[PDB]
């Protein structure tokens, strides 16, 4: 969706590739975060991203009780 | 896009409030799509959001095999 590919550090950009080439689409939202956190290494970004991508699984999973039901 | 779904209007906001009453953080990506497409009413945005959010879980499941053992 014309994603916010802003200021990818050499590690970030490298591991971002491994994701999309792995067929793991990244939410631009966590790119927005990651770029702000600004880590050093490929290992650090792949650690951080996988944990934050597991936060995402939870926030993609958790209960909304509908509310405005029809 | 001249609808009651411009850029966080009544319905999509009310449904965002329902999410966080429920404690569900939404990815910007959801909104960055949804808020353009414009749906009819509250259940209809939460239906779509819950769908694209379900994409995001099954996506955030997929395997990046690490690779960068630096």
From Swiss-Prot, chains A, B:
Biological process (GO), any one: viral DNA genome replication
Triggers of expression: Expressed abundantly in the early phase of the viral replicative cycle, especially at early infection times.
UniProt key word Metal-binding: no
Membrane topology, as annotated: Single-pass membrane protein
Site (Involved in oligomerization and DNA binding): 60
Organism superkingdom: Viruses
Location(s), subcellular: Host cell membrane
Annotated site residues (Involved in dimerization) in this chain: 53, 56
Spans annotated as DNA-binding: 10-70
Record key words, sorted: Coiled coil, DNA replication, DNA-binding, Early protein, Host cell membrane, Host membrane, Membrane, Transmembrane, Transmembrane helix, Viral DNA replication
One cellular component (GO) term of this entry: host cell membrane
An example Gene Ontology molecular-function term: DNA binding
Impact when changing residue 60 to W: No effect on dimerization, but unable to form higher order oligomers at elevated protein concentrations. Loss of DNA-binding activity
Function of the protein: Binds to the long stretches of ssDNA of the viral DNA replication intermediates created during the protein-primed mechanism of replication of the viral genome and attaches the viral DNA to the membrane of the infected cells. Required for the redistribution of replicating viral DNA from the initial replication site to membrane-associated sites surrounding the nucleoid. Required for the second pull step of DNA ejection.
Stated family: Belongs to the phi29likevirus gp16.7 family.
Subunit structure: Homodimer; homooligomer. Interacts with DNA; one dsDNA binding subunit is constituted by three p16.7. dimers.
Protein name: DNA replication protein 16.7
Organism of derivation: Bacillus phage phi29
Residues included from the entire protein: 63 to 130 of 130
């Amino acid at each position: 969706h014309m994603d916010k590919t802003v200021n990818l550090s050499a590690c970030e950009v490298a591991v971002l590739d491994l994701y999309e080439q792995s067929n793991i689409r990244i939410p631009s939202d966590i790119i927005e975060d990651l770029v702000n956190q600004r880590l050093q290494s490929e290992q650090e970004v792949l650690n951080y991203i996988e944990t934050q991508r597991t936060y995402w699984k939870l926030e993609n999973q958790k209960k909304l009780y509908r509310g405005s039901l029809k």
